[PDB]
Amino acid sequence: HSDMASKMYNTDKKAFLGALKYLPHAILKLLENMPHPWEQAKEVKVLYHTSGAITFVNETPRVIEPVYTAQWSATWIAMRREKRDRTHFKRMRFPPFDDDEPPLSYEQHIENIEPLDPINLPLDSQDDEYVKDWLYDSRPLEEDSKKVNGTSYKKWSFDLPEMSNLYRLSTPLRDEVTDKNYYYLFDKKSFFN
Amino acid sequence: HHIEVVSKQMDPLLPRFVGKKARKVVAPTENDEVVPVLHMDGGEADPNEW
Amino acid sequence: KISLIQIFRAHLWQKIHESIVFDICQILDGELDVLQIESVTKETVHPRKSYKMNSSAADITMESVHEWEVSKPSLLHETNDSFKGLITNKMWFDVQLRYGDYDSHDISRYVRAKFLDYTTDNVSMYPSPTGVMIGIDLAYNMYDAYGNWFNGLKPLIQNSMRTIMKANPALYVLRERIRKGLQIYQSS
Amino acid sequence: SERKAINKYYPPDYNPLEAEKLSRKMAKKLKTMNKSHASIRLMTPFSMRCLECNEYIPKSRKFNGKKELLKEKYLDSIKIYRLTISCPRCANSIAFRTDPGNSDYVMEVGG
Amino acid sequence: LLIHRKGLTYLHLDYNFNLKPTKTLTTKERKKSRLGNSFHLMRELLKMMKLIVDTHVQFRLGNVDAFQLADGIHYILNHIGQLTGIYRYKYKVMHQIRACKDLKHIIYYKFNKNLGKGPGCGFWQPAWRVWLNFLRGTIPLLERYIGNLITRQFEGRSNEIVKTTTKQRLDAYYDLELRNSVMDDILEMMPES
Amino acid sequence: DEINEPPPNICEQCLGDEANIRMTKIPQGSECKICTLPFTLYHFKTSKRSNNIIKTLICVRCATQRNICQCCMLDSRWHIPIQLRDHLISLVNEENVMTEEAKNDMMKRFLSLKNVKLGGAQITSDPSEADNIVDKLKNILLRAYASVDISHILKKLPLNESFLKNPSTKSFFLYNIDASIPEWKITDTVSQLLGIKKWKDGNSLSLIVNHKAKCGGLRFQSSELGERFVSKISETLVTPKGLKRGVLLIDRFRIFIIPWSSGFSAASFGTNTAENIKLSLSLNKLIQLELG
Amino acid sequence: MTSWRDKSAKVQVKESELPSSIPAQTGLTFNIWYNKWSQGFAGNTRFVSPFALQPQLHSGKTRGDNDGQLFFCLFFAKGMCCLGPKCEYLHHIPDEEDIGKLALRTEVLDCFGREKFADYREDMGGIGSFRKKNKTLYVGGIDGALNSKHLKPAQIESRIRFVFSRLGDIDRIRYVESKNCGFVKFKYQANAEFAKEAMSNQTLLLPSDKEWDDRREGTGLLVKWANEDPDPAAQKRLQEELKLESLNMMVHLINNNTNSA
Amino acid sequence: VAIKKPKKKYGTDIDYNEDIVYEQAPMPGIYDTSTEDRQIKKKFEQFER
RNA sequence: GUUCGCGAAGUAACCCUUCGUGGACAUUUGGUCAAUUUGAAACAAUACAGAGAUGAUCAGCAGUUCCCCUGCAUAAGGAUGAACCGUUUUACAAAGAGAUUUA
Ligand SMILES: O=P(O)(O)O[C@H]1[C@H](OP(=O)(O)O)[C@@H](OP(=O)(O)O)[C@H](OP(=O)(O)O)[C@@H](OP(=O)(O)O)[C@H]1OP(=O)(O)O
Ligand SMILES: [Mg+2]
Ligand SMILES: [Mg+2]
Ligand SMILES: [Zn+2]
Ligand SMILES: [Zn+2]
Ligand SMILES: [Zn+2]
Ligand SMILES: [Zn+2]
């Protein structure tokens, strides 16, 4: 469906045009499933029209909230160590392509190359032995039958050493306040008043 | 002839109701019977006051 | 916008940029023997290059007989240079034109930022390393050069640019179309 | 699309200076270039009387009419124009002259 | 395909989703080619979507480090007010733009503790959530808007447009009802003929 | 009424021979061929393994006003086209019945929304009013250019030679061809006579007939077929000078033949329409001279 | 049989040899919805068909013969079918056996399967009307077909008699020199619909002529549907054959009432 | 050479010469206008001749 | 092809291989749609016309339409969006005079 000049494409042109109302839903499902900084690549499950009109990403990105806080906290640490020791950080140019050149195809250009290393904190082995095997997976502990229900990925359950280890990584992003008297005239009931 | 009537599974992207346009139609009047306009007869005297 | 279209009409931005590139070459061959060039060559310039702020290339390329010893890349009004760093045979120029604002109009910062970005970029094609980059702010008629010099050009190029910024016929068209848009005359 | 548009899309292979040559050569062959009588919307400042259908152009009535640069040149150098106007009842063109020394107009054929 | 079905072949839609005219337009063309909010607000969403997808393409092609990719996405989501122009066509997005600006002040002055002023902060997770919640609320909007646009293409506009009264036409509609009431009361006082 | 709509009017021969037919209803399918206004498209297939979808082309209102089916648009009784139906009733009532149709789009739509019957649709859809007219059809079955210089052309037409066995020619000259009697009917009569049927595959015979000049010629490939064409024709007419001519015998007509003994080609008959009429006028005397 | 059923149908044009789907450029920008050229004027837009049907050569068995297809291949008639023996539609000149299959179907749609219309197109071109069983073609545009050879007034008719005789049984062929146009009437409508698409945009040259290398440069001939024949020598033939058609139908129709009783 | 028709401004523009425009036929009457229809048709066909 | 049987041959000794033969497992896709001229996009351009109420120049709202266009729109634009600006004869009678009939 690059060059739709034939008469056979007359029905499929109507399919492209009548899919334009569903296109904001395809943008939300694509941007919510965007790969996080510790991921090289991300296989998503898609639903597509058979005329190639629309391609919805048919997944919802669900995470373990203590694991997800620990993953961003490790990249928060890894990016403050990065900006500390880089001699010069080259921010890229926007937009990354010229508007005359078409979006180059995935298979002739992207798929053949080794991706890169992502942002991963090194995870010292004696302090982080319970998480370092599985912390930076796409879906962490997805096929472990005792930590999660299964590959439908709901209702996790951890042990104490794994849970205190994620607690320890998460210290740049945790709450760090334990008494509720800190929120005295600063809770939402005082905000409503 | 006993004929089963079924519905076609529409494509959700193609416009359903392909024959539906915004067109304008004039309609004929179906006048089979005349309605008798049943007034009364005629207090009809009138000067030039009106 | 319409004042800027009337000021920069008839492709003046491109005609300004060819005028500095031509005026540098007329000063390079005037003192060509002390520099010991075999030839100074202005390159074939893409017409979109003069107003392409994304990337650039070299304009004027210097080929040398003996192998030049260049310094560390320093600013135009730098005092001293240590020429013991790199020993190259070929240098380049780039003439950059920008239009400043109230915020970002330090031409010394702009030329250093572009030189340290374009030489580290893989897409921006320079024929050799160890070149200089001349930047001119067309809004504030300021000039600055940032790059490594081999010898003698830093007093030569700063004496040349003081003549160029006053005597360039394309810059005179720029300064006159500003004064007609501004309706300012100079008494006495 | 918009009254004010910052960017007009050019073809990906284009340049301004090579076009100026090319465009100038095209500018000799068109029918719009060779005929230059300027078409201008105007009002007549000096009531008319038609000479064929004796219609009267009230006081100052709108016309889309035709301005022509006259071969004459008032004094050593002052421009002078000739304006033409069609009649509402009949097909007839009436002509002007703009005298710069005597500020009022003087007219000719048809009115 | 929507541009070209409307006969607007003198408008060029770039690959970075910039819409520019290819020639100096006549007035009947400028009236005809005046696209509405639902076209442009759909076009600016695709500009925002492509601009994020292109940075992952730049990362995968080898041109961009993983720290620059995380900084690149953090730059996009905080500067959509100057990289797209989405605010021109739905100015309620000013809330989402000043939310991502206010999140940037919180993130930077916790990221840049004991660091210098520089680019490489890539904690794009809070500003990512703002736009995903903006996309949550304009799915029902643009499905209604573009759905009316496409059915107006396939079917034409309705002929039964009945204009409501407004401040613009209140004095006009007052007289049409006042003249009918006077014409009624006199036509009933008349004896005949 | 969009929720109360009539069932579709389709023929029995459109539906075919099978008992149960799976038909697909689309509530606003195509627009009508006649009134250009939308309707419920029914479409179906005769058998399950068929390869032709039979669509309903017209709406039910246009099918009722004409009393025709929606698929093949023949009349529901008598299964004939509309143009032949309104011509058969015109032979009974001795006045022209005719359904007239709009060429304007606002009047194609207007003419459909009225509840009348059109043409012969009052006669048909009443079985009493249809059957007596069939009985009235049965009584009908109880009845059951003088200025032209043509002399250059008539030298080339044979007109003076005889239809014997002895000349062995490919071409022949057929004259006395009426303005009726199509070109296919003369090739079929010759090919029936020789048994060289499906002649257009092998190209055994090639025939040119003018229909203005009332004359023609037929050329054979393989001259041995020429003696088969001579010998399979029995009846001949001898002109009272001599010079016997064979008769081809199209039903009720008589077509005379003489061996050309060369290939006549096109344009032998005439090179202008005004010129060809005088050759038929030239011949009409020779036919009367041949017979009487 | 010997010409048609014996062999199988042959690929006329290779699929790489098929023409480009975009038309010849008559505008400034191509339009993607309507596959046409937009800006600029409209220039001309009729060209000589590069392809032509050799009826005794290209005919043969196809996939549609074994499947019981009723409809003829449209691009067989244009000389353009790339599928050959793998094509779902028929690749032969219509015969009495073929039109007998189409007898229930020809009333609403042509021999190629395309649906007919209420009234004719304005220039009498296109598919046809179901309201008139038209069997007569208007062969026009002969000057661009001949590439402006003078030939004559009889030769031109000889070309028309040679070409259209291969496309089916013919009722009559009339050529009018003053109007420079021909009228070909067929025995069946299905041949007339077949020969209309076969001879649209073609050329009546033959190779035996010098211009055969420049056959593509011309305009091409128009085969369109013919109007009624205005002379009363033919008008009386129309009501005579309409009379015989009515008597042949009344015999068929009283047997329906005989069975109904 | 025939007279050219006026060009259609819009899509459903009506050729009033082409057809009886919005044919509101008279209501069916009892008095049997059958000989009268023949005589007008003959008189109208006579007028066109 | 798989699986359960039954039979025959060979290796066997009841198992393996071969081919005969009953079962079971699995069961009717798609098309409203064919690939350039002849079944229907439009715009630009050339030429001509030239722009509501008035004396002249301007703001506009509506209305009736078997015109619509842009717009998401029941908001608003489209020249006050356009078209209007022409054509124009009988429910027809009473009274009171001079020529022409008539028979
Ligand atoms: O110039 P300032 O007013 O002091 O602020 C700047 C400015 O951000 P703000 O103006 O919103 O504060 C820079 O970004 P822009 O505003 O130009 O988009 C930002 O740099 P980045 O956006 O690239 O991160 C920089 O912060 P930093 O130097 O840490 O990058 C920050 O200065 P402060 O950090 O002092 O607020
Ligand atoms: Mg308005
Ligand atoms: Mg208005
Ligand atoms: Zn006048
Ligand atoms: Zn209908
Ligand atoms: Zn039927
Ligand atoms: Zn085929």
**Number of Cβ within a 10 Å radius of residue A86:** 14
Whole-Å CA distances, F50 to F41, G68, G69, G100: 19, 9, 9, 18
* HSE value, Cβ hemisphere, 13 Å, CA-based, for C108: 5
Query: Between vectors from CA G186 to CA G185 and to CA G189, what angle results, nearest 5°?
Result: 115
What's the CA gap between A23 and E139, in Å, rounded? 9
What's the CA gap between F291 and F285, in Å, rounded? 10
What's the CA gap between G105 and B29, in Å, rounded? 37
Say yes or no for a CB contact (<8 Å) between A15 and B15. no
Cis geometry, peptide bond prior to residue A95 (ω within 30 degrees of 0): yes
Is residue A90 within 8 angstroms of chain C, CB to CB?
yes
- Is E167's C-beta closer than 6 angstroms to any atom of ligand 1? no
Query: Which pair of tokens denotes residue A49?
Result: 């029209």
Instruction: Specify which residues F174 forms β-bridges with.
Output: F216, F257
Chain E residues with beta carbon closer than 8 angstroms to that of D7: 18, 20
Instruction: Specify which residues C88 forms β-bridges with.
Output: C68
Q: Which 3 state secondary structure label does DSSP give G76?
A: helix
Could you tell me which of G88, C71, G32, E55 has the C-alpha nearest to residue A10? G32
Query: Which pair of tokens denotes residue D80?
Result: 């002078």
Give C187→chain D minimum CA distance, Å: 30
Q: List Cβ neighbours of E148 (8 Å cut-off, separation of 6 or more).
A: E38
In this structure, which long-range contacts are made by residues E150-156, counting pairs with CB atoms below 8 Å and at least 24 apart in sequence?
E150/A17, E150/A18, E150/A20, E150/A21, E150/B15, E150/E2, E151/B15, E153/A17, E153/E2, E153/E5, E153/E6, E154/A14, E154/B15, E154/B21, E155/B15, E155/B20, E155/B21, E155/B22, E156/B21, E156/B22, E156/B23
Which residue puts its alpha carbon closest to atom 26 of ligand 1?
A: E117
- Is E117's C-beta closer than 6 angstroms to any atom of ligand 1? yes
Whole-Å CA distances, F87 to F81, F82, G68, H8, H39: 10, 8, 35, 35, 22
* Residue G257, Cβ density class (10 Å: 0-12 exposed, 13-18 middle, ≥19 buried): middle
Bases of chain I within 7 A of a CB of the protein: 28-47, 49-51, 54-58, 60-63, 66-78, 91
In this structure, which long-range contacts are made by residues A51-55, counting pairs with CB atoms below 8 Å and at least 24 apart in sequence?
A51/A1, A51/A11, A51/A12, A51/A15, A51/A16, A51/B13, A52/A1, A52/A12, A53/A12, A53/A15, A53/A16, A53/A18, A53/A19, A53/B13, A54/A19, A54/A22, A54/A23, A54/A26, A54/B13, A55/A26
Q: List Cβ neighbours of D16 (8 Å cut-off, separation of 6 or more).
A: C11, C14, C47
Question: Which residues sit with Cβ closer than 5 angstroms to ligand 5, an ion?
Answer: F 32, 34-35, 59, 62, 112
What's the CA gap between C157 and C145, in Å, rounded? 9
The kind and range of the H/E element at F241 are none
The amino acid sitting at D49 is R
**Is the torsion defined by CA of E122, E125, E126, E131 positive or negative?**
positive
Could you tell me which of A77, A63, A38 has the C-alpha nearest to residue A148? A63
What's the CA gap between D9 and E5, in Å, rounded? 20
What's the CA gap between A117 and A134, in Å, rounded? 16
**Rg (alpha carbons) of chain D, rounded to whole number:** 20
Report CA(F102)–C1'(I74) in Å, whole number. Answer: 37
Experimental technique for the deposited model: cryo-EM
Nucleotide nearest to G87 (CA to C1'): I34
Concatenate the DSSP letters of all residues of F164-200 into one string.
-SS---SEEEEE---SSS-HHHHHHHHHHHHT--SHH
Residue F236: phi and psi, rounded to 5, are -140, 160
Query: Which pair of tokens denotes residue A150?
Result: 């299964």
Q: Which 3 state secondary structure label does DSSP give D107?
A: strand
The amino acid sitting at A85 is D
CB C17 within 8 A of CB C97: yes
Report CA(F78)–C1'(I25) in Å, whole number. Answer: 53
Could you tell me which of D89, F77, A167, E77 has the C-alpha nearest to residue G253? F77
Instruction: Specify which residues G182 forms β-bridges with.
Output: G139, G175
* Residue B43, Cβ density class (10 Å: 0-12 exposed, 13-18 middle, ≥19 buried): exposed
What's the CA gap between G68 and G88, in Å, rounded? 10
Is residue G41 within 8 angstroms of chain E, CB to CB?
no
Concatenate the DSSP letters of all residues of E91-142 into one string.
GGGHHHHHHHHHHHHHHHHHHTTTS-S-S-----HHHHHHHHHHHHHHHHHH
Could you tell me which of G228, G171, G229, G164 has the C-alpha nearest to residue G200? G164
Give E54→chain G minimum CA distance, Å: 26
Do F and E touch (≥3 CB pairs < 8 Å)? no
Q: Which 3 state secondary structure label does DSSP give G212?
A: helix
Q: List Cβ neighbours of C65 (8 Å cut-off, separation of 6 or more).
A: C36, C37, C38
CA E89 – ligand 3 centroid, Å: 29
**Number of Cβ within a 10 Å radius of residue F51:** 13
Query: Which pair of tokens denotes residue F278?
Result: 């005088």
What is the chain C residue with the closest CA to A94? C54
Helices C12-28 and C153-167: crossing angle in degrees, nearest 10, is: 140
Chain F residues with beta carbon closer than 8 angstroms to that of G130: 33, 73
Could you tell me which of E44, B15, E155, E141 has the C-alpha nearest to residue A17? B15
The kind and range of the H/E element at G249 are helix G232-260
Chain E residues with beta carbon closer than 8 angstroms to that of D5: 20-21
Could you tell me which of G91, G209, G84, G82 has the C-alpha nearest to residue G145? G209
Say yes or no for a CB contact (<8 Å) between A88 and C54. no
- Strand arrangement of the beta sheet that strand D93-98 belongs to: D38-43, D62-69, D81-86, D93-98, D105-107
Residues F166, F170, F176, F182: what is their CA dihedral angle, to the nearest 10 degrees? Answer: 140
Query: Which pair of tokens denotes residue A3?
Result: 């060059």
What's the CA gap between C35 and C30, in Å, rounded? 10
**Is the torsion defined by CA of E85, E91, E96, E99 positive or negative?**
positive
DSSP secondary structure code for residue A106 in this structure: I
What's the CA gap between D54 and D57, in Å, rounded? 10
Report CA(G222)–C1'(I103) in Å, whole number. Answer: 80
At which residue do the structure tokens 């994020």 appear?
A: E52
> Greatest CA separation found in chain A?
73
What is the chain C residue with the closest CA to D7? C1
Nucleotide nearest to F24 (CA to C1'): I32
What's the CA gap between F5 and D64, in Å, rounded? 60
CB A94 within 8 A of CB E76: yes
Query: Between vectors from CA C135 to CA C131 and to CA C137, what angle results, nearest 5°?
Result: 180
HEC string of D19-87? HHHHHHHHCCCCHHHHCCCEEEEEECCCCCCCCCCCCCCCCCCEEEEEEEECCCCECCCECCEEEEEEC
What's the CA gap between G194 and C35, in Å, rounded? 85
Say yes or no for a CB contact (<8 Å) between E55 and A96. yes
CB F30 within 8 A of CB F41: yes
DSSP secondary structure code for residue G214 in this structure: G
What's the CA gap between G5 and F173, in Å, rounded? 34
Which residue puts its alpha carbon closest to atom 4 of ligand 1?
A: E117
Report CA(H19)–C1'(I65) in Å, whole number. Answer: 21
**Number of Cβ within a 10 Å radius of residue C39:** 11
CB F43 within 8 A of CB F14: no
HEC string of F110-137? HHHHCCCCCHHHCCCCCHHHHHHHHHHH
* HSE value, Cβ hemisphere, 13 Å, CA-based, for A94: 24
What's the CA gap between G111 and G123, in Å, rounded? 21
What's the CA gap between G128 and G131, in Å, rounded? 9
**Is the torsion defined by CA of C1, C3, C4, C8 positive or negative?**
positive
DSSP secondary structure code for residue F256 in this structure: E
Q: How many residues does chain G have?
A: 261
Query: Which pair of tokens denotes residue G21?
Result: 């789907």
Report CA(A22)–C1'(I23) in Å, whole number. Answer: 54
What is the chain G residue with the closest CA to F33? G118
- Is E163's C-beta closer than 6 angstroms to any atom of ligand 1? no
CB C95 within 8 A of CB C20: yes
CB G176 within 8 A of CB G142: no
Chain H residues with beta carbon closer than 8 angstroms to that of B31: 27
The amino acid sitting at G25 is Q
Q: Where are the alpha helices (DSSP H) in C8-139?
A: 12-28, 32-35, 107-118
Nucleotide nearest to D34 (CA to C1'): I46
What's the CA gap between F205 and F228, in Å, rounded? 13
Q: How many residue contacts between B and E have a Cβ separation below 8 Å?
A: 20
What's the CA gap between F111 and F206, in Å, rounded? 51
Nucleotide nearest to E149 (CA to C1'): I72
Query: Which pair of tokens denotes residue C41?
Result: 């060559």
Query: Which pair of tokens denotes residue A21?
Result: 């109302």
What's the CA gap between H6 and A170, in Å, rounded? 81
CB F256 within 8 A of CB F174: yes
State CA F38 to chain mean position distance: 35
What's the CA gap between A29 and A61, in Å, rounded? 9
In this structure, which long-range contacts are made by residues G206-209, counting pairs with CB atoms below 8 Å and at least 24 apart in sequence?
G206/G159, G209/G149
- Is E108's C-beta closer than 6 angstroms to any atom of ligand 1? yes
3-state helix vs strand vs coil in chain A, percent to 5: 35, 5, 65
Say yes or no for a CB contact (<8 Å) between C54 and A90. no
Is residue G34 within 8 angstroms of chain E, CB to CB?
yes
Query: Which pair of tokens denotes residue E11?
Result: 């408008």
The kind and range of the H/E element at C72 are none
Is residue A88 within 8 angstroms of chain C, CB to CB?
yes
D90 is in an annotated binding site: yes
Give B22→chain A minimum CA distance, Å: 18
Query: Which pair of tokens denotes residue A90?
Result: 């080259």
The kind and range of the H/E element at C87 are strand C86-92
Q: Where are the alpha helices (DSSP H) in chain C?
A: 2-7, 12-28, 32-35, 107-118, 153-167, 169-182
DSSP secondary structure code for residue F102 in this structure: -
Concatenate the DSSP letters of all residues of C142-158 into one string.
EEEEEE---SSHHHHHH
Chain B residues with beta carbon closer than 8 angstroms to that of E150: 15
**Where are the strands (E) in chain A, listed by range?**
46-48, 55-57
Resolution (A): 3.7
D48 is in an annotated binding site: no
What's the CA gap between C76 and C115, in Å, rounded? 13
What's the CA gap between C61 and C39, in Å, rounded? 8
